[PDB]
């Protein structure tokens, strides 16, 4: 198994978000990502949701 051809983009975070989105769909991606770029850990990322911190009533 393999997947990759030349420098496309390679977005590991993107994945992380998705993974989270799954367990936590309520929260959007844009936000998730961002927070991800901050927390840099789906864990510390959810720690904000699980506890309820990132509140963006859109």
Would you give an account of this structure?
The structure is a monomer. The protein is an all-alpha fold and 58 residues long. It has a single domain (1-58), classed as Orthogonal Bundle (Helicase, Ruva Protein, domain 3). The protein has 3 helices and no strands. Helix 1 packs across helix 2 and helix 2 packs across helix 3. The chain starts with 11 loop residues before the first helix and ends in a 7-residue tail after the last helix. It comes from Homo sapiens. It is found in: Endoplasmic reticulum membrane. Residues 12-54 form the CUE domain. This is E3 ubiquitin-protein ligase AMFR.
Describe the structure concisely for a colleague:
The chain has 58 residues and is mainly alpha-helical. It has helices at residues 12-23, 29-39, 42-51.
List the main descriptive attributes of the protein structure presented here.
elongated; mainly alpha; 3 helices; 58 residues; Helicase, Ruva Protein, domain 3
**How would you name the CATH homologous superfamily?**
Ubiquitin-associated (UBA) domain
| N-end to C-end Cα span | 41 Å
Oligomer: monomer
Number of domains: 1
CATH architecture: Orthogonal Bundle
Summarize the main sheet. Answer: none
How many helix segments? 3
Could you give the topology of this structure?
Layout lengths: L11 H12 L5 H11 L2 H10 L7
PDB class: ligase
Keywords: Ubiquitin-conjugating enzyme, nppsfa, Ligase
Assembly: monomeric
């Amino acid at each position: 198994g393999s997947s990759g051809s030349s420098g496309a983009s390679n977005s590991q975070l993107n994945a992380m978000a998705h993974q989270i989105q799954e367990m936590f769909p309520q929260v959007p991606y844009h936000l998730v990502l961002q927070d991800l770029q901050l927390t840099r850990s789906v864990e510390i990322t959810t720690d904000n949701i699980l506890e309820g911190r990132i509140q963006v009533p859109f």
